[PDB]
Paper text:
The bacterial periplasmic methionine‐binding protein MetQ is involved in the import of methionine by the cognate MetNI methionine ATP binding cassette (ABC) transporter. MetQ, the substrate‐binding protein (SBP) for MetNI,5, 6 is proposed to play a dual role in transport by either binding l‐methionine for delivery to the translocation pathway of MetNI, or by facilitating d‐methionine uptake through the ligand‐free form when complexed to the transporter. Structural studies of SBPs in their ligand‐bound and ligand‐free forms have revealed a hinge‐bending or “Venus‐flytrap” mechanism where two domains of SBPs adopt their open conformation with an accessible binding site in the absence of substrate; substrate binding stabilizes the closed conformation, where the two domains come together and sequester the substrate. In this study, we report the structures of the Neisseria meningitides MetQ in substrate‐free form and in complexes with l‐methionine and with d‐methionine, along with the associated binding constants determined by isothermal titration calorimetry.
While multiple structures of MetQ methionine‐binding proteins have been determined, they all exhibit the closed conformation with bound l‐methionine, since MetQ has a high affinity for l‐methionine and is always isolated in the liganded form. Superposition of the l‐ and d‐methionine bound MetQ structures reveal their similar conformation, with rmsd ∼0.1 å. Not surprisingly, l‐ and d‐methionine bind to the same site, interacting with the same set of conserved residues. The α‐amino and α‐carboxyl groups of both l‐ and d‐methionine interact with residues R156, N213, and N238 located on one domain of MetQ, while from the other lobe, residues Y81, F98, H100, and Y103 pack around the methionine thioether group. The hydrogen bonds between the N238 side chain and the methionine α‐amino and α‐carboxyl groups appear to contribute significantly to the binding affinity, since mutation of this residue to alanine weakens the binding of l‐methionine by over 105. Short contacts to the methionine CB group are observed in both structures, with ∼3.3 å distances observed to the Y98 CO in the l‐methionine structure, and to the Y81 OH groups in the d‐methionine structure. The side chains of l‐ and d‐methionine adopt distinct rotameric conformations for the N‐Cα‐Cβ‐Cγ; Cα‐Cβ‐Cγ‐Sδ; and Cβ‐Cγ‐Sδ‐Cε torsion angles, which are approximately −175°, −175°, and −70° for l‐methionine and +170°, −80°, and −60° for d‐methionine; the latter values correspond to −170°, +80°, and + 60°, respectively, for l‐methionine.
Residue numbers in the entry:
A (entry chain D), B (entry chain C), C (entry chain A), D (entry chain F), E (entry chain B), F (entry chain E): 43 to 283
């Protein structure tokens, strides 16, 4: 039985090659890894049969993506996840924010929402009462207190954008793969709602191979490796640590 | 030199296999064709180096997609294109439309705009004066004259949607591959703004292989085949007829 | 398991890409399609294991080919099939036939027989009594009533031959892929003996994958698709329609 | 042209996926990465043609390996390299070393030599005067001052060996991929003679593709990435830093 | 450039794997070998494209086969060939032949001819005057002097036939691979007309890869290897030895 | 079940193609053969899963190899084996040996040991009393009686080395596949300790397929074939001959 994984470049792929693959080969499986630069192809490849499982996204992204693209896919288990941070760009500290400061943000709706929530936590904008934080959008801004100019970019552009904007809100996987350190962030997202999940075609939910993959990502050996290899990452809720 | 084409399923892939491939093999090329079900993967595969050229989209789609996804790709030449039509669903004629009739529409922005423009041409809604039809959005509706309920679906769902809605606005490539006939449309888009284009990475624009592909799609032999094989399609503007 | 289909270009490949592939992907298979422009390679590719199944031929062709070339292959199920027609070449109606008129025909024995049977049905030649129609050959001609000159060509060349002969007898798959319409035929073969069959290696006849492929080609969904997409095609006998 | 890289798992593969691949795609290449868990397979895969280039070894290893196995391969350029360290096992500090303490070491000759040189620098053994440090062997030990018991293992076993020996000398690539941190080493190899090299078949040494690969590994952008992503690594001599 | 060879099992395959493949890999080709148990499939696999070159037949076989099966293939160069022999079966010497003795023979026409010519040379039958020896058939027998019963079998069955017939005429390639020694023959065919040839698709006759294969089969190194690996074999006429 | 064999080129591969494969195909298996020209790749391919079984080595080689590379593989059954020989190089007879004569030898330790034992049996060197012949090394030489210069090479180079040294010690498989004859050896190793073994992954040792393979290599039919095809080979101990 060959299990084909798709991940983004970097940390999630290293998990497969450095730990999970050997655990699954012990049980008789072969393992293939396909890495993707972007957040858009992996669910489509999964749904079209080119992958058996992907590991790259949080559940708000998945729920939105599979509804919009009408994909019969579902989350399975969580994985250690590099958290979201607001990082110094042309400006190096939060106190330096000015009226009109620029903040770069990913341009897809579920990750853009995270930026609006962070900016509201910082007091730089104010969101309307009673909104759904997972779908926060420009229409939900009650007042742009500091007249922040939000510069929307494709997610992979955010590390580079630090040259062009005062502050950059950078997804963890792209921060790590560009050599950014999580400790460089001026403000980290407090939420745990965006710890990432693996996803499969719904038809494969009860499969023996997926049971064995799930066990591999929850073993004592994997937890010990993850705590050493991926310091500062947010853990699966089920690890209850 | 191997040229790798990406197209949607059906008509654009048949152009390659039935006519273009042999023309290019005469000049010493080998040809590979990858067919895609959806409109989202092809430009990303092209930009990431897995395809040399794709043939599946119109320029408003390309312009929106390459901006949103930060892709260094560009259009080259036009191809015969199945036109957009409003087709009978539960209701069989335009005169049967009622207050509250349901119309299915694709859920991506550049193709959704075409449905709003079509409904305005039919007099079922009224768009605000002076808005750009290429970016028509719900916000641009001045009055929903017949209180049309627009049912937004992923584009490939639109042929099957005819079972569930009064009328379906169906993209030509999906209509044709589902066995729908262009002559069954109750109304066809009169614009030529959406005749489809091939697309390449910008770095390849001056290549000899692309010159040879361009010539293949503009040869007397290809035109003679296309006029017979794809009756009722909109021809490239440059074909001049 | 990946199922590798081989078909001729055009209609039989579109059946795979537009309908069968998705049905099989729902059951966990992946699908690869290889398209051929000729009639000789597909059964050789099948027998050598480069294909698991091919869809391109009728049973008289298969019976003759597998015996001549010592191939351990066998038919499985029938598929909707474009019929054989006599089409206008230099002359545009049957009534214009003259003594010595030229008719192009395929040069392989089982398809050539079909042309002799057609010419006898038209009253342009007279075949001997009591012959096997599936193997009709020049020796079976009792009288060449109109002194027809039969121009034998490789089957793929028959659309192009219309410039050189008075009438062309063209196999449906090549007529469709060259942009000819079945309704343009001056006369269509009445027989149902040439509805095409899938073929596999005999060793695979009892496989689960082949059972699932057979089911996909006999489903209500495929039948509904075929009746819309391939109007005028001759149906499998087992569909009993 | 497709360039096939072979690397060990982890850091050298991440260099390809996170930085080098995109640099080469801008010049028109596609890139394939094959990752290995051991030190023996990659040069064999290179010599057989499965790989165009590998990145996993130092030159003393390569010189020995290509001579012993009569392989027509050669080094090209250096890459940032995780250094060799002596790490705590059952004992946690250098001055806890006792008479008879166990030290695990790789069992291949060029890497075993490094352990003997390290033990001499620590004063735990004394090597003979005037030896070749690159081929230091047990015969070159003048006195085993602390009666160290050297436990020889296949190199990939050395991270796990920390449970069984007092101290473990672990190659950097395996340390990193097991979640060990370079700052955890009690003593790091001073030498720069084991900064790793890419290798190719000698027949390819003058190729354009290799020139482009070499440029990609010496670009300002790669150096900036490497200094951030791989802190504490030893740099190519040619970088002159 | 991947050169795919097809051979029968045994000696001709060993030539490729032991000597030719390395000669071609030095020049940068890759090589694959497919082996076949029978004489019918290899030319079909060559014609279909699976093979680039085959080595298994003599020219009378090829001339007959490509005409009968309508294949556009051609001979290129000769190879050292195991000769044809009449071997002991139930009877152990030629002098033991009796009226009615049974002789097994291959059942394909060009190899059956060789048996008739051999039986005529032995004085067991008498062929008619002025016949073409390459096409000698039962119709060409003037008198069956010893009323030999010729038992026609598939060529591969002839080594095993020795249990069932008085004498067996066995093709060299099958003799060698069944553990028979050429010195065991009671009578060996004198002719050199059946020294075997490589064959290719005619389209490939002027290719550079074929020039390089031809050189490998005619080098001083290959001749030295063949003279002792294949003792008793008949050499290419062009070697003029 | 498809059983994948790996062998060195030549004799061990012919055993599979000419006898074993058909014996296993009669029980319903399919068989694939991968041939190697070196001694290092086959156990690595076995351990990685590319092969199910290999046939190329003796047990002293296997024991050393699996320990050095920490591979979980094990021997199963013996096979007829071409013996080790000392062959003429620049000198043609044993009596011509001189002080300083050169003898080429394989450079791997378990095969090098065999050379030293052979040279001691010949009286050209003198090994120390009582040393383990399986691990004989240069340090076990008491006196180099004839000041032999031993030229160590990778094993596959040893046939060609005959141009450069006075005498060459060549492994049987390489002697056969280079067109050397075993009967032309000046001295053949008499020991039976190096009759070769098949090897598998330890996890497969109790499999049904391996039981069927073992039976195939010990059948009366295989023994009869081997004694004809491989004259002068050393037989498996289990054959009790
Ligand atoms: C594709 S959704 C974003 C995933 C990314 N790893 C994150 O946690 O921010
Ligand atoms: C991806 S944009 C839509 C393309 C489609 N062929 C059309 O013309 O409607
Ligand atoms: C290869 S036999 C001919 C097949 C063709 N599709 C026909 O029905 O005429
Ligand atoms: C294969 S030689 C050892 C290579 C390893 N990356 C090191 O620098 O220690
Ligand atoms: C396929 S023709 C027969 C070939 C065989 N090698 C022979 O020389 O007898
Ligand atoms: C790989 S160990 C050497 C094997 C060789 N066939 C021999 O018996 O000498």
């Amino acid at each position: 039985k060959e299990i084909v994984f798709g991940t983004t470049v970097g940390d999630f792929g290293d998990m497969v090659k450095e730990q999970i693959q050997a655990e699954l080969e012990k049980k008789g499986y072969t393992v293939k890894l396909v890495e993707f630069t972007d957040y858009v192809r992996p669910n489509l490849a999964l749904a079209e049969g080119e992958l058996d499982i992907n590991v790259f996204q949080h559940k708000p992204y998945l729920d939105d993506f599979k509804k919009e693209h009408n994909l019969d896919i579902t989350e399975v288990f969580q994985v250690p996840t590099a958290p979201l941070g607001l990082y110094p760009g042309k400006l190096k500290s939060l106190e330096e924010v000015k009226d009109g400061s620029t903040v770069s943000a990913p341009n897809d709706p579920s990750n853009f929402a995270r930026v609006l929530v962070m900016l509201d936590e910082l007091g730089w904008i104010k969101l309307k009462d009673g909104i759904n934080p997972l779908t926060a959008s420009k229409a939900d801004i009650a007042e742009n207190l500091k007249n922040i100019k939000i510069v929307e970019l494709e997610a992979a552009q955010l590390p580079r954008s630090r040259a062009d904007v005062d502050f950059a809100v950078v997804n963890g996987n792209y921060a790590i793969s560009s050599g950014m350190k999580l400790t460089e962030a001026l403000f980290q997202e407090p939420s745990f709602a965006y710890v990432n999940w693996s996803a499969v075609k719904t038809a494969d939910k009860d499969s023996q191979w997926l049971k064995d993959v799930t066990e591999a990502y929850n073993s004592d050996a994997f937890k010990a490796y993850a705590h050493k290899r991926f310091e500062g990452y947010k853990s699966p809720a089920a690890w209850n640590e």
